[PDB]
Amino acid sequence: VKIGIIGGTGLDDPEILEGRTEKYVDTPFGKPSDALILGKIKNVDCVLLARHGRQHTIMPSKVNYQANIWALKEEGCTHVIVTTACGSLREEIQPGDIVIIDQFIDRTTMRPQSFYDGSHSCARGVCHIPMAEPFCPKTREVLIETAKKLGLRCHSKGTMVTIEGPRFSSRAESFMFRTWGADVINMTTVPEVVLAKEAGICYASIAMATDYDCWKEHEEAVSVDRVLKTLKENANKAKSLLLTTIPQIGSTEWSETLHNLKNMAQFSVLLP
Amino acid sequence: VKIGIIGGTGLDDPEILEGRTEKYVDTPFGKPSDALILGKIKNVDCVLLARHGRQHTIMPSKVNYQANIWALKEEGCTHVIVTTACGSLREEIQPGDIVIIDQFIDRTTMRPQSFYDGSHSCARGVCHIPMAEPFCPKTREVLIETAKKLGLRCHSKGTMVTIEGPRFSSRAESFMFRTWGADVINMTTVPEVVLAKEAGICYASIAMATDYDCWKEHEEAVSVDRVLKTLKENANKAKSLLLTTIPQIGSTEWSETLHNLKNMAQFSVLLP
Amino acid sequence: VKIGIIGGTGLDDPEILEGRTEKYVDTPFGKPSDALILGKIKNVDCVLLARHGRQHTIMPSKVNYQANIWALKEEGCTHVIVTTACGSLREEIQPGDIVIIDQFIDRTTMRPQSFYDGSHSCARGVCHIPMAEPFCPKTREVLIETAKKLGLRCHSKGTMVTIEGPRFSSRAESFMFRTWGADVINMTTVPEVVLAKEAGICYASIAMATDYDCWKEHEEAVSVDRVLKTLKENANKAKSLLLTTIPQIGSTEWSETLHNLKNMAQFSVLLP
Ligand SMILES: CSC[C@H]1O[C@@H](n2cnc3c(N)nc(N)nc32)[C@H](O)[C@@H]1O
Ligand SMILES: CSC[C@H]1O[C@@H](n2cnc3c(N)nc(N)nc32)[C@H](O)[C@@H]1O
Ligand SMILES: CSC[C@H]1O[C@@H](n2cnc3c(N)nc(N)nc32)[C@H](O)[C@@H]1O
Ligand SMILES: [Cl-]
């Protein structure tokens, strides 16, 4: 196994890896957000990638999701575990809580969601990837059991609505998303989750709630500074969860799980 | 009358027409998906066009809806009847059922939906086309009565949600679409239906359900291979329905219906 | 204070201003829709801008929202009050009624919604603007009290759903939008409201309902001609409301309100 880690806002710390070497790569879809950081957690090979770049320079609409996933695939990653900062759409999901999300609702509009775009020899045909179960259940289960072992406030499921951004939602939108069954809100899960599935990678997401979105009365206003402060306070939780989870993934059996993902990916392609 | 036929996935068979001649055309909006196939059904002139191209090469996001409709308009089509493969969002819409859809919900994001884009001398101004009744009721009624005459399982109405694709929906999305009142799901109805209306064409759609989308428990997973297999099993139904419907359209009175569409189209344009 | 006025469909009359001088400007985001019209209402400096251009030439998808707001910002506008023609999604919002909207739901797909797009030296970084309260409450309150003083049918709140257009909604869409909590429907509020907020401008909207959208039974069909006719009949109301409101804004205290908007705008930017 080899674990890709895509680090989100306030949740991307190279110091998580030992024996670090940076590696700039190129892909048929362009350059990834930043250099790949190759390293290890205990005996497990990992590849860390900052979603928003070295200096947090890249807006969610313009993150190169294709290049990021393709680069991790080419580096040999069998798994991708990510972190993402999000807002809470449910009273029971408190700021600082982790949510091991199991569904999404797409509200993005400007984003390529397939490698198979008719313009790349490396991905020929039309791909219709199944999304009934977008996140790897086995990885999610190890995250859930590990969060429990650590005593962390963690939710075992949740539906992430991904908005285009970069603005936050209106209050009317926040309310509407709750009625649609969304539990947490962010700007990056789609199309990252979709492209991972096309690549035949086991993908899971550690979502960190930083605030209640503006549906909720009598809370502080949603703001960049409040998001960043809450992340600073809680980032250690994601780091511990990754550090403790990854060696357990490394000693689990994956051949069958990975073979089924590979088959799903290859059989989703219509060839001419 | 002259009937344009846009054939969808597994539902585009040139052998439906007699006296066939292929004709490659160009439009101010680019090239259509494939050559126009000119021919006849009994005494009625028809024009068949494969939505996804000769070799099923074109993803739904990149189908040239403008060129397809413009080409059929220029060829003299008064009517466009299409086929489309779709998923079912309702228990009563079984795989293999036909749905004569009467509404849509747009979930597409990347698609031009008007000929009047400010860049074409052939379509000057701003067009705000009415969409309260997107599909031609008279054609729909002939399809419905003909399906009954053939003894086919057919639904007399239905709301198609068109997603951007090319991925299938998440389970959270599938559930949400049901709450919005969607009955079937596909990737091509919008903007095809909109552009037909701008062109003053009577447009109707034969939607063929191939599976229950992933909202439904205890069904096979949604997949390309299962969609194609179900289409192979049921394609004869769409072919018979078209073959039997088209001569009845050819002997019906349309002058008033077509005049009202023409007026609606022309009066929807704001000129400078 | 200096009041930007963006005039919508049938609701853009230069004769509202005295001492008029036209001024064509350029911006880092391109040219605004038309010349800025500098003038006065009583003693208050104003800048009028036709949203759709001189000759109503520009479709809602292609209005340069960035250039319009940037141009008004650069001209020194502290406030932007706009007019917009809309459809009603509620029985109680009758054609001819004004709605002082306080929320939106975005259904647009093709539109830049930030100045901070990574390509402009004038707007560096990533901006995540809060949208819990998208419209300036103090301006809205002056509009509401002024409409009452004028005896006008006016609604003190309302949620605008902005669709991509240029087509009108399907009936299935119209119904769905009501379930989401939308009250009125248009094609221009987003991203205009978002960009104003990024610019630190107090923004409010005078929405004029021209018809019931097609959810409602036993009404005339929605059409361009009917929209324009209803606007012709009711445009005087918006003109009076603006004329009477603007001198009251000009004699109100704004330093604190504007300072808070400025802080919100500047603190929403993540720098590298
Ligand atoms: C630094 S500010 C931008 C970051 O904030 C995260 N985030 C937190 N709370 C919310 C919220 N309520 N709504 C939305 N859309 N995003 C939110 C978002 O995913 C992104 O990672
Ligand atoms: C060959 S695989 C792609 C084809 O499958 C049709 N289709 C069938 N079932 C579904 C479903 N459940 N969801 C969605 N989105 N599309 C579906 C779709 O319209 C396209 O024609
Ligand atoms: C001249 S025709 C185009 C103009 O009509 C306004 N408008 C009025 N009624 C409706 C309606 N029912 N639905 C939608 N989308 N827009 C509507 C719309 O905002 C634009 O300002
Ligand atoms: Cl939507």
CSV table of N, CA and C in Angstrom, one decimal, chain C residues 30-131:
chain,number,residue,atom,x,y,z
C,30,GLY,N,-12.5,44.5,-17.5
C,30,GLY,CA,-13.1,44.8,-18.8
C,30,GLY,C,-14.0,46.1,-18.7
C,31,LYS,N,-14.8,46.3,-19.7
C,31,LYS,CA,-15.6,47.4,-19.9
C,31,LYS,C,-17.0,47.2,-19.2
C,32,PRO,N,-17.5,48.1,-18.4
C,32,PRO,CA,-18.9,48.0,-17.9
C,32,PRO,C,-19.9,47.9,-19.1
C,33,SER,N,-21.2,47.6,-18.7
C,33,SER,CA,-22.2,47.4,-19.7
C,33,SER,C,-22.4,48.6,-20.6
C,34,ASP,N,-22.2,49.8,-20.1
C,34,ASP,CA,-22.5,51.0,-20.8
C,34,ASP,C,-21.7,52.2,-20.1
C,35,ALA,N,-21.7,53.3,-20.7
C,35,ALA,CA,-21.2,54.5,-20.0
C,35,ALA,C,-21.9,54.7,-18.7
C,36,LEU,N,-21.1,55.2,-17.7
C,36,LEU,CA,-21.6,55.7,-16.4
C,36,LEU,C,-22.3,57.0,-16.7
C,37,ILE,N,-23.5,57.2,-16.2
C,37,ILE,CA,-24.2,58.5,-16.2
C,37,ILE,C,-24.0,59.2,-14.9
C,38,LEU,N,-23.2,60.2,-14.8
C,38,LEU,CA,-23.0,61.0,-13.6
C,38,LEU,C,-24.1,62.0,-13.5
C,39,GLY,N,-24.7,62.2,-12.3
C,39,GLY,CA,-25.7,63.2,-12.1
C,39,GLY,C,-26.0,63.3,-10.6
C,40,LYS,N,-27.1,64.0,-10.4
C,40,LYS,CA,-27.6,64.2,-9.0
C,40,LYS,C,-29.1,64.0,-8.8
C,41,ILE,N,-29.4,63.6,-7.6
C,41,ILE,CA,-30.8,63.6,-7.2
C,41,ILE,C,-30.9,64.5,-6.0
C,42,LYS,N,-31.6,65.6,-6.1
C,42,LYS,CA,-31.5,66.7,-5.1
C,42,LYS,C,-30.0,67.0,-5.0
C,43,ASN,N,-29.4,66.9,-3.8
C,43,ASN,CA,-28.0,67.3,-3.6
C,43,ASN,C,-27.1,66.0,-3.6
C,44,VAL,N,-27.7,64.8,-3.9
C,44,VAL,CA,-26.9,63.6,-3.7
C,44,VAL,C,-26.2,63.2,-5.0
C,45,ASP,N,-24.9,62.9,-5.0
C,45,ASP,CA,-24.2,62.5,-6.2
C,45,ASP,C,-24.6,61.0,-6.5
C,46,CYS,N,-25.0,60.8,-7.8
C,46,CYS,CA,-25.3,59.5,-8.3
C,46,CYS,C,-24.6,59.1,-9.5
C,47,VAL,N,-24.6,57.8,-9.8
C,47,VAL,CA,-24.0,57.2,-11.0
C,47,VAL,C,-24.9,56.2,-11.4
C,48,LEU,N,-25.5,56.4,-12.6
C,48,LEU,CA,-26.5,55.4,-13.2
C,48,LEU,C,-25.7,54.5,-14.2
C,49,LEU,N,-26.0,53.2,-14.2
C,49,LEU,CA,-25.5,52.3,-15.2
C,49,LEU,C,-26.6,51.3,-15.6
C,50,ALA,N,-26.8,51.3,-16.9
C,50,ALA,CA,-27.7,50.3,-17.5
C,50,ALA,C,-27.2,48.9,-17.5
C,51,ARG,N,-27.8,48.0,-16.7
C,51,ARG,CA,-27.3,46.6,-16.6
C,51,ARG,C,-27.1,45.9,-18.0
C,52,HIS,N,-28.1,46.1,-18.9
C,52,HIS,CA,-28.1,45.3,-20.1
C,52,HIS,C,-27.5,46.2,-21.3
C,53,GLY,N,-26.9,47.3,-21.0
C,53,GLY,CA,-26.3,48.2,-22.1
C,53,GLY,C,-27.3,49.2,-22.6
C,54,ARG,N,-26.8,50.1,-23.4
C,54,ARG,CA,-27.6,51.2,-24.0
C,54,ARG,C,-28.8,50.6,-24.7
C,55,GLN,N,-28.6,49.7,-25.6
C,55,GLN,CA,-29.7,49.1,-26.5
C,55,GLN,C,-30.3,47.8,-26.0
C,56,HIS,N,-30.1,47.5,-24.7
C,56,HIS,CA,-30.5,46.2,-24.1
C,56,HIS,C,-30.1,45.0,-25.0
C,57,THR,N,-28.7,44.9,-25.1
C,57,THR,CA,-28.1,44.1,-26.0
C,57,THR,C,-27.4,42.8,-25.4
C,58,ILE,N,-27.4,42.8,-24.0
C,58,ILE,CA,-26.5,41.9,-23.3
C,58,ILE,C,-27.3,40.8,-22.5
C,59,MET,N,-27.1,39.6,-22.8
C,59,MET,CA,-27.9,38.5,-22.1
C,59,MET,C,-27.4,38.4,-20.6
C,60,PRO,N,-28.2,37.9,-19.7
C,60,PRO,CA,-27.8,37.9,-18.3
C,60,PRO,C,-26.5,37.2,-18.0
C,61,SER,N,-26.3,36.0,-18.6
C,61,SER,CA,-25.1,35.2,-18.5
C,61,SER,C,-23.8,36.0,-18.9
C,62,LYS,N,-24.0,37.0,-19.8
C,62,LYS,CA,-22.8,37.7,-20.3
C,62,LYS,C,-22.6,39.1,-19.8
C,63,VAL,N,-23.5,39.6,-18.9
C,63,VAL,CA,-23.3,40.9,-18.2
C,63,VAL,C,-22.0,40.8,-17.5
C,64,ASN,N,-21.2,41.9,-17.6
C,64,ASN,CA,-19.9,41.9,-16.9
C,64,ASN,C,-20.1,42.5,-15.5
C,65,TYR,N,-20.5,41.6,-14.6
C,65,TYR,CA,-20.8,42.0,-13.2
C,65,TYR,C,-19.6,42.5,-12.5
C,66,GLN,N,-18.4,41.9,-12.8
C,66,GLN,CA,-17.2,42.4,-12.2
C,66,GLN,C,-16.9,43.9,-12.6
C,67,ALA,N,-16.9,44.1,-13.9
C,67,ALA,CA,-16.6,45.5,-14.4
C,67,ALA,C,-17.6,46.5,-13.9
C,68,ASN,N,-18.9,46.1,-13.9
C,68,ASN,CA,-20.0,47.0,-13.4
C,68,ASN,C,-19.7,47.5,-12.0
C,69,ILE,N,-19.5,46.5,-11.1
C,69,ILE,CA,-19.3,46.8,-9.7
C,69,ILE,C,-18.0,47.6,-9.5
C,70,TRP,N,-16.9,47.1,-10.2
C,70,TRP,CA,-15.6,47.7,-10.0
C,70,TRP,C,-15.6,49.2,-10.5
C,71,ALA,N,-16.3,49.4,-11.6
C,71,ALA,CA,-16.4,50.8,-12.1
C,71,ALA,C,-17.2,51.7,-11.1
C,72,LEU,N,-18.3,51.2,-10.5
C,72,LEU,CA,-19.0,52.0,-9.5
C,72,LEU,C,-18.2,52.2,-8.3
C,73,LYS,N,-17.4,51.2,-7.8
C,73,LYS,CA,-16.5,51.3,-6.7
C,73,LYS,C,-15.4,52.4,-7.0
C,74,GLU,N,-14.8,52.3,-8.2
C,74,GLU,CA,-13.8,53.3,-8.5
C,74,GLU,C,-14.3,54.7,-8.7
C,75,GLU,N,-15.5,54.9,-9.1
C,75,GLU,CA,-16.2,56.2,-9.2
C,75,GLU,C,-16.5,56.8,-7.8
C,76,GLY,N,-16.3,56.0,-6.7
C,76,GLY,CA,-16.5,56.5,-5.4
C,76,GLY,C,-17.9,56.1,-4.7
C,77,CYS,N,-18.6,55.2,-5.3
C,77,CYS,CA,-19.9,54.8,-4.8
C,77,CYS,C,-19.8,54.1,-3.4
C,78,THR,N,-20.5,54.6,-2.5
C,78,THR,CA,-20.6,54.0,-1.1
C,78,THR,C,-21.8,53.0,-1.1
C,79,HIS,N,-22.8,53.3,-1.9
C,79,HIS,CA,-24.0,52.5,-2.0
C,79,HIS,C,-24.3,52.2,-3.4
C,80,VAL,N,-24.9,51.0,-3.6
C,80,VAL,CA,-25.4,50.6,-4.9
C,80,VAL,C,-26.9,50.2,-4.7
C,81,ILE,N,-27.8,50.9,-5.3
C,81,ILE,CA,-29.2,50.5,-5.2
C,81,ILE,C,-29.6,50.1,-6.7
C,82,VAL,N,-30.2,48.9,-6.9
C,82,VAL,CA,-30.5,48.5,-8.2
C,82,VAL,C,-32.0,48.2,-8.4
C,83,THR,N,-32.4,48.2,-9.7
C,83,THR,CA,-33.7,47.7,-10.0
C,83,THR,C,-33.5,46.4,-10.8
C,84,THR,N,-34.5,45.5,-10.6
C,84,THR,CA,-34.5,44.2,-11.4
C,84,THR,C,-35.9,43.7,-11.6
C,85,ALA,N,-36.2,43.4,-12.8
C,85,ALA,CA,-37.5,42.8,-13.2
C,85,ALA,C,-37.4,41.3,-12.8
C,86,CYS,N,-38.5,40.8,-12.2
C,86,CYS,CA,-38.6,39.4,-11.7
C,86,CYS,C,-39.9,38.8,-11.9
C,87,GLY,N,-40.0,37.5,-11.8
C,87,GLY,CA,-41.2,36.7,-11.7
C,87,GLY,C,-41.6,36.5,-10.3
C,88,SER,N,-42.9,36.3,-10.0
C,88,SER,CA,-43.3,36.0,-8.6
C,88,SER,C,-43.5,34.5,-8.5
C,89,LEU,N,-43.0,34.0,-7.4
C,89,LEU,CA,-43.3,32.6,-6.9
C,89,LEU,C,-44.3,32.5,-5.8
C,90,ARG,N,-45.0,33.6,-5.5
C,90,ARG,CA,-45.9,33.5,-4.3
C,90,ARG,C,-47.2,34.3,-4.7
C,91,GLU,N,-48.4,33.7,-4.4
C,91,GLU,CA,-49.6,34.3,-4.7
C,91,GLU,C,-49.7,35.8,-4.2
C,92,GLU,N,-49.2,36.1,-3.0
C,92,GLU,CA,-49.3,37.4,-2.4
C,92,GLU,C,-48.4,38.4,-3.1
C,93,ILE,N,-47.3,38.0,-3.8
C,93,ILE,CA,-46.5,38.9,-4.6
C,93,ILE,C,-47.2,39.0,-6.0
C,94,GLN,N,-48.0,40.1,-6.2
C,94,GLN,CA,-48.7,40.3,-7.4
C,94,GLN,C,-47.9,41.0,-8.4
C,95,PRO,N,-48.2,40.8,-9.7
C,95,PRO,CA,-47.6,41.6,-10.7
C,95,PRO,C,-47.7,43.1,-10.5
C,96,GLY,N,-46.6,43.8,-10.5
C,96,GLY,CA,-46.6,45.2,-10.2
C,96,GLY,C,-46.1,45.5,-8.8
C,97,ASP,N,-46.0,44.5,-7.9
C,97,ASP,CA,-45.5,44.7,-6.6
C,97,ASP,C,-44.0,44.9,-6.6
C,98,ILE,N,-43.5,45.6,-5.6
C,98,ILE,CA,-42.1,45.7,-5.4
C,98,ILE,C,-41.7,44.8,-4.2
C,99,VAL,N,-40.6,44.2,-4.3
C,99,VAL,CA,-40.1,43.3,-3.3
C,99,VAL,C,-38.7,43.8,-2.9
C,100,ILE,N,-38.5,44.1,-1.6
C,100,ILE,CA,-37.2,44.6,-1.1
C,100,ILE,C,-36.4,43.3,-0.7
C,101,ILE,N,-35.8,42.6,-1.6
C,101,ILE,CA,-35.3,41.3,-1.3
C,101,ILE,C,-34.2,41.3,-0.3
C,102,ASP,N,-34.2,40.3,0.6
C,102,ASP,CA,-33.2,40.1,1.6
C,102,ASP,C,-32.3,38.9,1.6
C,103,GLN,N,-32.7,37.9,0.7
C,103,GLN,CA,-31.9,36.7,0.5
C,103,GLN,C,-31.8,36.3,-1.0
C,104,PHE,N,-30.9,35.4,-1.3
C,104,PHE,CA,-30.9,34.8,-2.7
C,104,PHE,C,-30.6,33.3,-2.6
C,105,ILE,N,-31.0,32.6,-3.7
C,105,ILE,CA,-30.6,31.3,-3.9
C,105,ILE,C,-29.9,31.3,-5.3
C,106,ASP,N,-28.7,30.8,-5.4
C,106,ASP,CA,-28.0,30.8,-6.6
C,106,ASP,C,-28.4,29.6,-7.4
C,107,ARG,N,-28.8,29.8,-8.7
C,107,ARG,CA,-28.9,28.7,-9.6
C,107,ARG,C,-28.1,29.1,-10.9
C,108,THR,N,-27.2,30.0,-10.8
C,108,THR,CA,-26.4,30.4,-12.0
C,108,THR,C,-25.3,29.3,-12.0
C,109,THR,N,-24.7,29.2,-13.2
C,109,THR,CA,-23.6,28.3,-13.4
C,109,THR,C,-22.3,28.8,-14.1
C,110,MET,N,-22.5,29.8,-14.9
C,110,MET,CA,-21.4,30.1,-15.8
C,110,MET,C,-20.6,31.4,-15.4
C,111,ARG,N,-20.8,31.8,-14.1
C,111,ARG,CA,-20.5,33.2,-13.8
C,111,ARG,C,-19.3,33.4,-12.8
C,112,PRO,N,-18.3,34.2,-13.1
C,112,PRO,CA,-17.3,34.6,-12.0
C,112,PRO,C,-18.0,35.3,-10.9
C,113,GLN,N,-17.8,34.9,-9.7
C,113,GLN,CA,-18.4,35.5,-8.5
C,113,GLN,C,-17.5,36.2,-7.6
C,114,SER,N,-16.2,36.4,-8.0
C,114,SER,CA,-15.2,37.1,-7.2
C,114,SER,C,-14.3,37.9,-8.0
C,115,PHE,N,-13.8,39.0,-7.5
C,115,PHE,CA,-12.8,39.8,-8.1
C,115,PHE,C,-11.4,39.1,-7.9
C,116,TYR,N,-11.3,38.2,-6.9
C,116,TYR,CA,-10.0,37.6,-6.5
C,116,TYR,C,-9.8,36.3,-7.2
C,117,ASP,N,-9.6,36.4,-8.5
C,117,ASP,CA,-9.6,35.2,-9.3
C,117,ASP,C,-8.2,34.7,-9.6
C,118,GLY,N,-7.2,35.2,-9.0
C,118,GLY,CA,-5.8,34.8,-9.2
C,118,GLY,C,-5.1,35.4,-10.4
C,119,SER,N,-5.8,36.2,-11.2
C,119,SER,CA,-5.3,36.8,-12.4
C,119,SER,C,-5.3,38.3,-12.4
C,120,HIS,N,-5.5,39.0,-11.3
C,120,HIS,CA,-5.6,40.5,-11.3
C,120,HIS,C,-4.8,41.0,-10.1
C,121,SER,N,-3.8,41.8,-10.4
C,121,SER,CA,-3.0,42.5,-9.4
C,121,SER,C,-3.8,43.4,-8.5
C,122,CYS,N,-4.9,43.9,-8.9
C,122,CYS,CA,-5.8,44.8,-8.1
C,122,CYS,C,-6.6,44.0,-7.1
C,123,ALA,N,-6.6,42.7,-7.1
C,123,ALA,CA,-7.4,41.9,-6.2
C,123,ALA,C,-6.6,40.6,-6.0
C,124,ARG,N,-5.6,40.7,-5.0
C,124,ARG,CA,-4.7,39.6,-4.8
C,124,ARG,C,-5.2,38.7,-3.6
C,125,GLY,N,-5.0,37.4,-3.8
C,125,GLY,CA,-5.4,36.4,-2.7
C,125,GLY,C,-6.7,35.7,-3.0
C,126,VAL,N,-7.2,35.0,-2.0
C,126,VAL,CA,-8.5,34.2,-2.1
C,126,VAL,C,-9.5,34.9,-1.2
C,127,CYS,N,-10.6,35.2,-1.7
C,127,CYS,CA,-11.6,35.9,-0.9
C,127,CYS,C,-12.8,35.0,-0.7
C,128,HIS,N,-13.1,34.8,0.6
C,128,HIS,CA,-14.3,34.1,1.0
C,128,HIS,C,-15.3,35.0,1.7
C,129,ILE,N,-16.1,35.7,0.9
C,129,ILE,CA,-17.0,36.7,1.4
C,129,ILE,C,-18.2,36.1,2.2
C,130,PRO,N,-18.5,36.6,3.4
C,130,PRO,CA,-19.7,36.1,4.0
C,130,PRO,C,-21.0,36.6,3.3
C,131,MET,N,-22.0,35.7,3.2
C,131,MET,CA,-23.2,36.0,2.5
C,131,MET,C,-24.5,35.7,3.4
